[PDB]
Amino acid sequence: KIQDSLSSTASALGKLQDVVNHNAQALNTLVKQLSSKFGAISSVLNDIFSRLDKVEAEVQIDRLITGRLQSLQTYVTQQLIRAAEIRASANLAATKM
Amino acid sequence: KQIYKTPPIKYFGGFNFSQILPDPSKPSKRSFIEDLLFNKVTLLICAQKFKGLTVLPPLLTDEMIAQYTSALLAGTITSGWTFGAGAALQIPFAMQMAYRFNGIGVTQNVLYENQKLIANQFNSAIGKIQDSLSSTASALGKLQDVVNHNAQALNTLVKQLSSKFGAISSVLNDIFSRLDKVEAEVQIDRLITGRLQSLQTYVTQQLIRAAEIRASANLAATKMSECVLGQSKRVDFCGKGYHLMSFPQSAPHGVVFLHVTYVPAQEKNFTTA
Amino acid sequence: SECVLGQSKRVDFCGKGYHLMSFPQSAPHGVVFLHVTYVPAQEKNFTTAPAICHDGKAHFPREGVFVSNGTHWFVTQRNFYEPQIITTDNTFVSGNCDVVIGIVNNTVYDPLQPELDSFKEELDKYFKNHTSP
Amino acid sequence: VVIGIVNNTVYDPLQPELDSFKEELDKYFKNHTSP
Amino acid sequence: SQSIIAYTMSLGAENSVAYSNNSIAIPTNFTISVTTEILPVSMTKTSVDCTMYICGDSTECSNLLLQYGSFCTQLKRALTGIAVEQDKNTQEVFAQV
Numbered sequence: 001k002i003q004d005s006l007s008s009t010a011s012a013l014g015k016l017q018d019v020v021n022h023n024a025q026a027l028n029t030l031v032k033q034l035s036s037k038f039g040a041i042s043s044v045l046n047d048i049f050s051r052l053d054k055v056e057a058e059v060q061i062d063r064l065i066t067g068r069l070q071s072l073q074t075y076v077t078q079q080l081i082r083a084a085e086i087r088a089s090a091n092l093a094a095t096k097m
Numbered sequence: 098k099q100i101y102k103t104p105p106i107k108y109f110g111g112f113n114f115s116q117i118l119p120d121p122s123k124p125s126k127r128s129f130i131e132d133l134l135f136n137k138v139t140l141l142i143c144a145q146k147f148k149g150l151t152v153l154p155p156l157l158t159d160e161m162i163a164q165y166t167s168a169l170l171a172g173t174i175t176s177g178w179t180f181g182a183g184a185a186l187q188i189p190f191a192m193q194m195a196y197r198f199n200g201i202g203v204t205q206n207v208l209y210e211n212q213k214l215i216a217n218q219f220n221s222a223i224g225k226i227q228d229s230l231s232s233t234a235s236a237l238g239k240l241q242d243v244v245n246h247n248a249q250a251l252n253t254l255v256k257q258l259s260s261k262f263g264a265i266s267s268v269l270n271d272i273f274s275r276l277d278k279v280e281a282e283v284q285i286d287r288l289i290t291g292r293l294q295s296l297q298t299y300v301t302q303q304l305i306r307a308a309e310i311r312a313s314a315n316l317a318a319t320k321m322s323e324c325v326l327g328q329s330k331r332v333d334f335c336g337k338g339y340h341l342m343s344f345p346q347s348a349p350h351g352v353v354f355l356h357v358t359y360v361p362a363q364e365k366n367f368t369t370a
Numbered sequence: 371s372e373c374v375l376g377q378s379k380r381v382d383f384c385g386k387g388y389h390l391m392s393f394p395q396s397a398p399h400g401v402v403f404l405h406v407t408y409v410p411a412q413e414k415n416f417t418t419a420p421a422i423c424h425d426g427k428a429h430f431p432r433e434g435v436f437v438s439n440g441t442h443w444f445v446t447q448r449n450f451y452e453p454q455i456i457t458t459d460n461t462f463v464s465g466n467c468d469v470v471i472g473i474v475n476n477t478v479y480d481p482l483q484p485e486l487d488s489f490k491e492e493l494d495k496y497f498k499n500h501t502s503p
Numbered sequence: 504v505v506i507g508i509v510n511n512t513v514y515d516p517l518q519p520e521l522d523s524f525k526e527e528l529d530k531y532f533k534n535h536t537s538p
Numbered sequence: 539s540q541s542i543i544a545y546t547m548s549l550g551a552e553n554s555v556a557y558s559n560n561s562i563a564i565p566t567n568f569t570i571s572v573t574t575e576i577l578p579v580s581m582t583k584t585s586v587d588c589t590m591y592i593c594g595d596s597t598e599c600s601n602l603l604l605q606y607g608s609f610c611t612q613l614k615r616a617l618t619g620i621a622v623e624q625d626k627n628t629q630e631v632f633a634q635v
């Protein structure tokens with residue numbers, strides 16, 4: 001009877017499913033984030049340098065570097081939280097076994 | 098709650114505890130095993146912390162932690178395991194160990210009939226441990242990266258303030274003596290926000306690390322409650338085998354257990370119905 | 371799951387002492403447990419020996435520990451003073467009494483002793499009731 | 504009903520407690536029937 | 539007759555156990571005691587508005603907050619994860635029957 005119950009519905013393996021979804025939704029937001037302007041002229045670094053003189057262009061890009069860099073520190077910090085939860089469930093599966 | 102002490106006579110039925118009980122010759126009251134442990138973990142750069150990075154001393158001094166451990170080892174060899182649940186009740190050691198055997202599934206009639214062999218077999222085991230601890234440099238690895246991660250993280254904090262973050266210079270005084278005050282406030286903001294996000298990052302990592310030490314001080318407090326103050330029925334919790342007892346030892350920023358376990362020797366086939 | 375829905379063998383988990391049972395109580399943003407534990411009261415010391423030799427063979431307590439108050443020996447529970455007379459029902463034999471150290475001498479009365487002292491004497495009374503004529 | 508049971512003899516401990524007394528009580532009968 | 543004093547900590551009342559190789563101690567009585575114990579199980583749920591906190595009642599601030607991308611959707615997503623988790627902490631303790 002166990003064999004049919006596992007294959008009955010799509011919510012049986014839910015615990016192992018949101019683990020792989022949360023690790024693929026987090027990547028998409030990281031990729032999609034670099035289309036944002038953060039208050040700069042444009043979202044492309046190449047076109048900023050070819051429209052503004054060097055004295056002023058150093059203001060816009062710093063407003064774009066500090067945004068892309070902060071959007072990457074957030075991703076690491078979230079992973080440190082998640083890795084401390086799986087570590088709490090690999091220490092329970094090592095006790096069940 | 099009380100600080101017990103072992104009697105002057107140290108004849109515990111043949112078992113030799115000289116390696117774990119306190120040693121009075123040394124200026125501190127630390128056993129022989131505790132000395133090897135304290136000489137294997139090492140705790141001008143500390144004077145290069147003129148930026149405000151200080152280290153506070155722990156509340157419990159080392160010479161007082163060695164007294165807690167002494168009472169654990171002197172109330173677990175005279176009173177058995179009765180002192181963790183009420184009034185400590187003395188019991189001969191050769192007779193207490195007959196109760197640890199009785200809790201495995203082996204009747205007590207085997208300990209007395211093999212008392213001399215078992216005592217020597219336990220005496221040799223404790224001797225081999227002392228050399229194993231001092232054999233390699235990876236024995237105390239778990240207590241080592243704890244002190245490395247907390248001093249390697251401080252150096253990156255200090256070295257981080259030599260960066261510019263897109264400003265003219267990394268030195269704060271020379272920015273003011275070269276630019277008019279109307280726009281010198283633009284450069285300094287780049288330098289006072291980088292130096293401030295480099296310090297918020299340090300705190301956040303400490304909150305993560307302190308949550309993984311708190312999860313190991315809640316396992317050492319369970320190993321001491323169950324393995325030491327009793328006999329554990331949980332398989333593979335207090336050592337690989339059938340548990341018998343344990344002996345705590347102190348160490349820098351940690352604790353070391355000495356699990357004594359029972360393991361079956363050679364076997365023989367048989368026919369059963 | 372353990373203290374409330376059962377009795378726990380983990381020492382110093384469901385209270386300070388030997389656990390008996392527990393009661394939950396609700397509270398704002400938490401729970402409160404009421405652990406009921408068993409603690410031994412006053413104690414008295416005795417003199418003990420690990421085995422007893424009667425017919426040249428060692429004897430060990432089936433459950434309990436040998437104690438004495440000076441005159442003659444007894445076997446009692448581990449955690450409550452209740453002495454009982456040594457009897458073959460209380461003990462089991464394992465080998466002769468020379469290999470063991472610390473063994474002491476006393477007498478073990480088999481549980482059939484009342485089953486014989488009230489019968490063999492009765493049978494001897496029966497035997498004397500029929501041999502005389 | 505049980506599967507795998509095998510044949511052997513279980514020795515009564517109470518029997519020698521009477522067999523040695525059958526060696527005594529019945530012997531007393533043998534010691535008393537003959538005269 | 540009051541002042542502030544500084545001393546050294548005491549680890550507890552010193553005790554000595556008269557260990558001997560033919561002496562045992564058996565308790566002749568027992569007592570029953572009841573001990574309390576308190577444990578937190580959940581904390582208050584919270585939600586935060588994207589814009590009213592940052593650009594409150596200003597029409598010229600909310601429009602340029604959109605150039606920062608999907609930042610506060612992550613905040614809504616993160617705080618909702620905590621909120622829905624707090625219902626599991628109470629559903630796993632009291633709901634075992």
Ligand SMILES: *[C@@H]1O[C@H](CO)[C@@H](O[C@@H]2O[C@H](CO)[C@@H](O[C@@H]3O[C@H](CO)[C@@H](O)[C@H](O)[C@@H]3O)[C@H](O)[C@H]2NC(C)=O)[C@H](O)[C@H]1NC(C)=O
Binds near residue numbers: 439442
């Ligand atoms: C150690 O414990 C033993 C076991 O209880 C004590 O021996 C027993 O003591 C009781 C009370 O003293 C005796 O009962 C009395 O016996 C006399 C004998 O004539 C009788 O006249 C009284 O009416 C009463 O029944 C009991 O007989 C005795 N056991 C035996 C086998 O004689 C012993 O006194 C204890 N010793 C110490 C130092 O505590």
Ligand SMILES: *[C@@H]1O[C@H](CO)[C@@H](O[C@@H]2O[C@H](CO)[C@@H](O[C@@H]3O[C@H](CO)[C@@H](O)[C@H](O)[C@@H]3O)[C@H](O)[C@H]2NC(C)=O)[C@H](O)[C@H]1NC(C)=O
Binds near residue numbers: 474475
């Ligand atoms: C407990 O009881 C046993 C038996 O009742 C005691 O063993 C007996 O000990 C005596 C010594 O006092 C032995 O006597 C010896 O006889 C040999 C000759 O065979 C002689 O050369 C020795 O000098 C000594 O007199 C006796 O043989 C021995 N009984 C047996 C069956 O071996 C035992 O000593 C008692 N325990 C205590 C602590 O008193």
Ligand SMILES: *[C@@H]1O[C@H](CO)[C@@H](O[C@@H]2O[C@H](CO)[C@@H](O)[C@H](O)[C@H]2NC(C)=O)[C@H](O)[C@H]1NC(C)=O
Binds near residue numbers: 113114115116224
């Ligand atoms: C318990 O073990 C210790 C350590 O092995 C013994 O101390 C040794 O005794 C021998 C015999 O004289 C010496 O050669 C060693 O140098 C001692 N070692 C140390 C570290 O001091 C001790 O003798 C043993 N206990 C008993 C009762 O023999």
Ligand SMILES: *[C@@H]1O[C@H](CO)[C@@H](O[C@@H]2O[C@H](CO)[C@@H](O)[C@H](O)[C@H]2NC(C)=O)[C@H](O)[C@H]1NC(C)=O
Binds near residue numbers: 365367
């Ligand atoms: C005797 O015990 C052994 C196990 O030590 C049984 O198995 C034999 O020994 C090893 C272990 O599998 C194999 O290499 C042998 O081939 C085994 N023997 C056979 C016949 O397979 C062995 O079966 C036992 N024999 C009896 C008679 O009890």
Ligand SMILES: *[C@@H]1O[C@H](CO)[C@@H](O[C@@H]2O[C@H](CO)[C@@H](O)[C@H](O)[C@H]2NC(C)=O)[C@H](O)[C@H]1NC(C)=O
Binds near residue numbers: 509510
């Ligand atoms: C175990 O013993 C029993 C009785 O001692 C055996 O049962 C007898 O089996 C024979 C056949 O060999 C029959 O003729 C008898 O009628 C059986 N006795 C009864 C009371 O039914 C049994 O066969 C033995 N088992 C084995 C495996 O030999």
Ligand SMILES: *[C@@H]1O[C@H](CO)[C@@H](O)[C@H](O)[C@H]1NC(C)=O
Binds near residue numbers: 496499
């Ligand atoms: C002795 O035997 C006679 C019969 O011969 C019987 O009546 C009597 O009760 C017996 N007495 C006892 C004490 O058994």
Ligand SMILES: *[C@@H]1O[C@H](CO)[C@@H](O)[C@H](O)[C@H]1NC(C)=O
Binds near residue numbers: 507
């Ligand atoms: C063990 O298995 C074999 C084959 O699988 C079978 O012939 C034999 O009867 C079995 N033994 C018992 C006691 O059932």
Ligand SMILES: *[C@@H]1O[C@H](CO)[C@@H](O)[C@H](O)[C@H]1NC(C)=O
Binds near residue numbers: 531534
């Ligand atoms: C047999 O009976 C006689 C008395 O008639 C007695 O003296 C003798 O001891 C008895 N024999 C045995 C072995 O009991």
Ligand SMILES: *[C@@H]1O[C@H](CO)[C@@H](O)[C@H](O)[C@H]1NC(C)=O
Binds near residue numbers: 106108472559560
């Ligand atoms: C108990 O120890 C003392 C001294 O160590 C010794 O003289 C005595 O024989 C020991 N008692 C037993 C029963 O071994």
